[PDB]
Structure formats: C-alpha cells, structure tokens
C-alpha cells in the first residue's frame, strides 16, 4: 500500500481483444505524457489478452487517468484502471 | 476535528430542514466559544474563502452566532478583514472576491453595518484613482465590489442611496475609460451573433444596472437568512476596521482580464422554465455558483455531476442548459481550462447517466450550435471541441447524425466547418480501426475520412534500382534482418555517395520500414541504432534530415510521427529547436494548418518547460555550482525555442501579406486565420513564461514597425496583465 501510492503505472484491464498499443497511447495519453505501454500476450500465441500496463512520467498524470480514464470506454468496453507496484518481466502473459 | 465536520458538513442531505440545522448548529458552537473559539473562527474564515457555493448558508450561521454573542461576531468580523489584507498580500485574488463577497452578505444578516460596505467599496472603487499601476489592479478592485452587488445591492441603495450614486459615476467613468486590447485575443467566437462575447467588466455592469433599474430586486439567490427575520436585527450590527487597499509593489500578481462565454437564450429551451437572460445578475450567480461547484468537486467526477445537477434556487431554471453551458465556458476558456480538459469529457458523460433522459438532448443541441458557430471560433477552442467531441463519440459507439452538417460537403476544405469533420474523424480513428470509421459516416462523407495509416518505402518492391543509395539500402535491408550491429551499419553506409543526406535518407527510410509494425518495433529501433542517430545527426542539419525523412516515409500517420518525434526528443536524437524549424519548413508546407502539427509543436515545447522546472528544482534542494550554471543554460536553450518559433511565425506571416498585397488579394484566407490564432496561442498556452521575455520580444521581434496585423498579436498578449 506504501507503494502503490508513489507509482506511475496502471494496470489496464477489460480491453478487447482487438485493442492496440496505438489506441492506448492515443487514450492514455489525454491525461499525460506516457513513458511505456506493454501489452499483455497470451503465453503461446503470443496474441493479446485483454490487459496492459500503462507508465507515466509523474504521479499526477496517472492520478487523472484514475479520475477521468478509469470508467471510460475504449473499443465499446468499460475498461479499469488499478494502481500497480509496476511492471516485471514476464507478467506481460 | 468534530467541529470542523459539523462546519464543513453543514446544508448537506439531512432530515431536518436547513432552518433547523443552522439553529442547532449555532448553539452547538457557542457552547464550544469558550474552548474552541479560536479554531471555531478559524473553521469560520477558512469556509468563507473555500466554499463561496455556499455562501448564503455560513452567513447565516455566523448571524446566528452573532446573535447568541455580539463579542465573538466582532472578533470574527475583525479576522476576516484580517484574512482578507492577507490574501491580497500572497496575490490570492481570486479568494479574496470571495471573502469580500461573504463580508457582503453579512450586511443582509445584519451582522455588518451598510455603511462599512459602503465606505469599503469607496475605497475600492479610488484604486482607479491610483496612477502608474497596471489596468488588471484597478479591474479587480472593481470586480470584488460590482460582483458583490447581487447579494447586497438593495441593502446598500437603501441606506446610502446617494454616496453609491456617486460611487457608480466614478465606477462608469473609469470603465468607460479603459482598454479593450485584450479583447480579441480572449473571445472564443469574434462574431456578434447570436451572442456577442463580451468583456467581463462590461457585461458584469449591464447587470447591475438592469438589476439598478430593476429595483434591486433579483429572483434567484437563497436567502436562508430570511427565515430568521425576528432573531436577525440592526441591534446586532457591527462597524468595519478601516481598510486600506494594499499598495501596487513589484511581486504584485493580478488575474487576467476575461471574456464572458454565451452560446444560450430562453428560445433554446421553450418548454422548460424561462431561462435568466444575459444582462441579468440572476444568470451571473447561477454561473459563478456552478463554476465553483466545479471548483470543489473537479477530482471526484461523481460528486461533482451530483452537485451540479442539485444546485437550489429560489426559482426554477433550465439548470441543464445552464450546467452545459458552465462546462463548455470552461473546456473553451483561453487562455486556458481551469481544469484538466479530459476532465470535462468525462463530467458530461457522469451527467448523462444522472439524467438519461434530458441531458443527452441538451448536450446534443449544445453541440449542433458549436458546428454551426465554427465560422470565427478560435482556433485554440476548435481544438478542444474536436478533441472533446470525437472522444466523446467514442464513448456511445461513434453515432451522429452526420447528415445534419452536410453544407460543409462544398465549402473550401481549408474552412472551419469542413475542417472540424476532417480533423474529428482523423482523432476517432486513433481511438478505432481505419474501415470502421470510414463506415460511420453517410456516403456523402467518404471524402473526408483519414487515409489508411500505411507507411512509405522510397526503396522497396515498387522503386527503380535507378535511386541514389539503391543498392546501398539493400544491403542495409538485410544487415537489419541478420540482427546487425552499428559498426555493421556504420560500414555499409560508407558506400552511399554524397553532412551526407543520403546516408541518412538511406538509413531512415530502411530501419523504419523495417518497424513499421508497432510503436513498440519502431521505439526499440530508435534505441537499437541510437548511436548511428546521434552520429548522422550531430550537426544541426543532420537533426533537420532526420525529421525530413522521417515525414517523408510516415505522412499518413500523424499519430507515429508524434510518438516518433518525441522518442527522438527524450533520447536527445533531435532538440527542439530542430523540431521548431522543421515544422515551419516547406516539407510541411501543405500539412501546416492540420491538427498534429501544432500537438507536436507544444508537446515539444512541454518538455523542454519541464526540462527547466526539473533543474530548477534540483537546485533549489540543493540550496551547487555546477548546477547554477545548468539552470541558465537551460533557460538559455527555452529562450531560444520561443524566440524560433516566434521568428518563424513572423516570417510566414510576412511573406503572406506581402504575398497577398503583391497579388492583390485579401489576407483573411482560411490559411491566415490558422496561422494568426496559432501564433495567439503560442502566448496563450505559455504566458507565464513569455512575460520573461518581454524586453527581447519588444526590441528584436515585435517591433513597432512590424505589420500591425502580427504586432497586435503581441499587444493583445502584452495586455493580459498591463
């Protein structure tokens, strides 16, 4: 809990199938400047999931995508945004 | 920490009526004076600068407690006087209104005498007097006392009619008196129909004299005081401290003069109640109450929408035009939003789901007068709607009667209203998939839908092995593929025939190609080869090939080109001020007015303000002469962005006119009003930082012999705070 509350990552999920990297820097990024996108692949196919991860440079960028991004949607679906300790190799899958 | 939530909870959901829980409230507080009276007169001046929605309430509260201790009302009057010298000294203007404003109203609880208001106001009111000091100090001062008018106007004409005669022949003389340059550069539409989009100043003094000829008397403000007409009495009145309005000193801060934002009349809503026309001080505090409201509330999007959709009053209202209105006065604000754009997108569709079944008409209502008024929006605003507008259609699966702005089928493309469609439907496609947006659109419409995203090869299955570098790229083809180094690299373009712009072209055009399949491939090239970058693009003609080429192969996708110029940013591939030069040369010529470019250009010069602010804050900890030397280093390469971009904004702009004056033509063409209002909002976005500026901008930029079409632009800026 001492973490979550100094990161810059969210855990995206909820996203379509069909829902690109591209498309979420282009929502995402209508809260701040984005640092990385990793998209979650399916451990074989390599084919997304349905989730992401999403850095931002500052705290306050991330705290206005959990405002104001975090209910919204994006390829027709309610999508969620959680804080995160962030981003480790491998739970990309 | 239990009377500050009883304080600050007070007039919210309750069983009891207000009436009830005022009176109880305020015995709950005298009990409490003889051990808490000074946090008590803390709580007391802390909700009266915080809170102004509800102002009318805690005015009644502290009549009240007046009325159960005279003493206690004297200190607290005697607090808040001192509250407010305080405000005035740490600048914070804004809270200051609002203080004024509760000292106002006590008047009406009968807790301050008519007479201090009366006298306060004079000497407000001769700061117009004061000579040498900037028009944005004698326009606050002005402010506090005409925006107070609604909650005491009547009090105050009926005990001192005369001296406020005398006071309003001074007030009108000195409106009468000011400059309106900042005018134009603030106004979201410049037309005068349907609504003229008046100063502040000028609009605020039509109402009071309506409501001056009205008789004083306004039909919207809650008055709870009213309720209490046999406990609230003269009796208990007290007489104000002198009050000297703190001098104008070199760290004085004043707010920006305003525009009043007007797209409603009661036509607009015909079955619903009679909506409170523009000169009336009942549609001033409705606005100014649910911009506050906003104020309190702008994190927790739910809580705001309830409140906003909860506002009271005295009579009934077309409360959804009037909180339709506030967002939008807000999102187009300029210079900016009080707020976080993305926030209000959000607000609108939390009120949608609070009432499903009259929000949504108004709001699409709202938005049929947005297109229809696109002819003389600013450009900064437009920029807003689009984006506004096409994430919000992607919120309620892109539907829109499309057919309903048909006339912008054949107008020049280069006009507002076609424009707007294009730019919209390039911003939906970001959110969706190329074919899916190319379907949401009426036939008629097919034309102005954004091209497939698709990159460019100059070298690949389709080119002439006749190009400069062919058999170069080739090779460079496969040295990618086998997982090359950049020694590797570094050896084969040695072979490319000529600063080589062809090494780079070669280069560019073959590693890009080779990515084109994400964000992702594209950025971890840019880090693979990131030596090779910096190498070709060391001098400052290399950084200038480098965005050239990279245009040339991803033109038909705005979006990578951003993502890709920023990488080059942040990994110090480009600066800024290639950036600035790039966007201003003839590559982009045809490309100039859209959208991307001007998102790229300040999300640009966003990093190197944060940049600064970054060093700026590591020496101010440390606070060591490696970083004093860093800092205006780094203000020296800021300076300079904004002196480019400044420069090449004069430089286009000067050809055009003369251009326009050699040919004969006019130079109000769509291209120049981009152009201007781009300009305008290169001192819009960044004020505060060009006010630094100022000597250098006078005397080598915009100089007085400058094209008055370009200097007023500088004269506009230079009056938000003269």
């Not at chain 1, 451990?43 to 997304?48: H, Y």
């Given at each position: 809990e001492k973490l979550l509350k100094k990161s810059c990552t969210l855990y995206v999920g909820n996203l379509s199938f069909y829902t690109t990297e591209e498309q979420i820097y282009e929502l995402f990024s209508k809260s701040g400047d984005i640092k990385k996108i990793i998209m979650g692949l399916d451990?074989?196919?390599?084919?997304?999931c349905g989730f992401c991860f999403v850095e931002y440079y500052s705290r306050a960028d991330a705290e206005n995508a959990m405002r104001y991004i975090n209910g919204t949607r994006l390829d027709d679906r309610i999508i969620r945004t959680d804080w995160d300790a962030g981003f480790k190799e491998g739970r990309q899958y | 920490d239990h009377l500050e939530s009883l304080i600050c909870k007070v007039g919210e959901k309750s069983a009891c009526s207000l009436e009830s829980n005022l009176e109880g409230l305020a015995g709950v507080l005298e009990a409490d004076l003889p051990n808490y009276k000074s946090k008590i007169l803390r709580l007391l001046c802390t909700v009266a600068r915080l809170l102004p929605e509800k102002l009318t309430i805690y005015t009644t509260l502290v009549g009240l407690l007046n009325a159960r201790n005279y003493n206690f009302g004297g200190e607290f009057v005697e607090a808040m006087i001192r509250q407010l010298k305080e405000s005035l000294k740490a600048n914070n203007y804004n809270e200051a209104v609002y203080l004024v404003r509760f000292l106002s109203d006590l008047v009406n609880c009968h807790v301050i005498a008519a007479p201090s208001m009366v006298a306060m106001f004079e000497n407000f009111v001769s700061v117009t007097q004061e000579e040498d000091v900037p028009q944005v100090r004698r326009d606050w001062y002005v402010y506090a006392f005409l925006s107070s008018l609604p909650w005491v106007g009547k009090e105050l004409y009926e005990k001192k009619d005369a001296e406020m005669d005398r006071i309003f022949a001074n007030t009108e003389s000195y409106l009468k008196r000011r400059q309106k340059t900042h005018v134009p550069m603030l106004q979201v539409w410049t037309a005068d129909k349907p609504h003229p989009q008046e100063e502040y100043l000028d609009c605020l003094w039509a109402q009071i004299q309506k409501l001056k000829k009205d008789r004083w008397q306004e039909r919207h403000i809650l008055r709870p005081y009213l309720a209490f007409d046999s406990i609230l009495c003269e009796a208990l009145q007290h007489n104000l401290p002198p009050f000297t309005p703190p001098p104008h000193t070199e760290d004085s801060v004043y707010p920006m003069p305003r525009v009043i934002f007007r797209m409603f009349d009661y036509t607009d809503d015909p079955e619903g109640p009679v909506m409170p026309g523009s000169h009336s001080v009942e549609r001033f505090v409705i606005e100014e109450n649910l911009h506050c409201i906003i104020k309190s509330h702008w994190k927790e999007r739910k809580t705001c929408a309830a409140q906003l959709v909860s506002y009271p009053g005295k009579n009934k209202i077309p409360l959804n035009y009037h909180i339709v209105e506030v967002i939008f006065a807000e999102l187009f604000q300029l210079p900016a939003p009080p707020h976080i754009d993305v926030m209000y997108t959000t607000l609108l569709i939390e009120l949608c789901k609070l009432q499903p079944g009259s929000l949504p008409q108004v709001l699409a209502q709202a938005t049929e007068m947005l297109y229809m008024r696109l002819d003389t929006m600013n450009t900064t605003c437009v920029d807003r709607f689009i984006n506004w507008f096409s994430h919000h259609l992607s919120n309620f699966q892109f539907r829109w009667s499309w057919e309903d702005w048909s006339d912008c089928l054949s107008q020049d493309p280069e006009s507002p209203k076609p424009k707007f469609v294009r730019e919209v439907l390039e911003k939906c496609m970001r959110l969706s998939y190329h074919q899916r947006i190319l379907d949401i659109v009426p036939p008629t419409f097919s034309a102005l839908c954004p091209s497939n995203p698709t990159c460019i090869y100059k070298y690949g299955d389709e080119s002439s092995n006749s190009l400069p570098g062919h058999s170069v790229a080739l090779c460079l083809a496969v040295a990618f593929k086998s997982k090359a180094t950049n020694d590797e690299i570094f050896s084969i373009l040695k072979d490319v025939p000529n600063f080589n712009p062809l090494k780079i072209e070669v280069f560019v055009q073959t590693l890009l190609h080779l990515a084109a399949k994400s964000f992702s491939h594209s950025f971890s090239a840019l880090a693979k080869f990131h030596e090779v970058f910096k190498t070709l693009a060391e001098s400052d003609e290399g950084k200038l090939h480098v965005l050239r080429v990279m245009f040339e192969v991803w033109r038909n996708h705005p979006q990578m080109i951003a993502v890709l110029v920023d990488k080059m940013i942040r990994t110090q591939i480009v600066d800024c001020a290639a950036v600035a030069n790039w966007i201003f040369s003839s590559e982009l010529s045809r490309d100039f007015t859209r959208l991307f470019v001007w998102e790229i250009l300040h999300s640009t010069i966003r990093k190197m303000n944060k940049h600064v602010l970054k060093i700026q804050k590591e020496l101010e900890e440390a606070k060591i002469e490696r970083l004093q030397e860093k800092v205006e280093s780094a203000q020296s390469e800021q300076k300079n962005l904004f002196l480019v971009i400044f420069q090449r904004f004069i430089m286009i702009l000067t050809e055009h006119l003369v251009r326009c004056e050699t040919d004969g033509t006019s130079v109000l063409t769509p291209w120049y009003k981009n152009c201007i209002e781009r300009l305008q909002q290169i001192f819009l976005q960044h004020h505060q930082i060009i006010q630094q500026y100022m000597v250098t901008l006078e005397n080598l930029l915009f100089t007085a012999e400058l094209d008055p079409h370009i200097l007023a632009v500088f004269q506009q800026f230079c009056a938000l705070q003269a």
């Open positions: 451990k074989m196919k390599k084919t997304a | -």
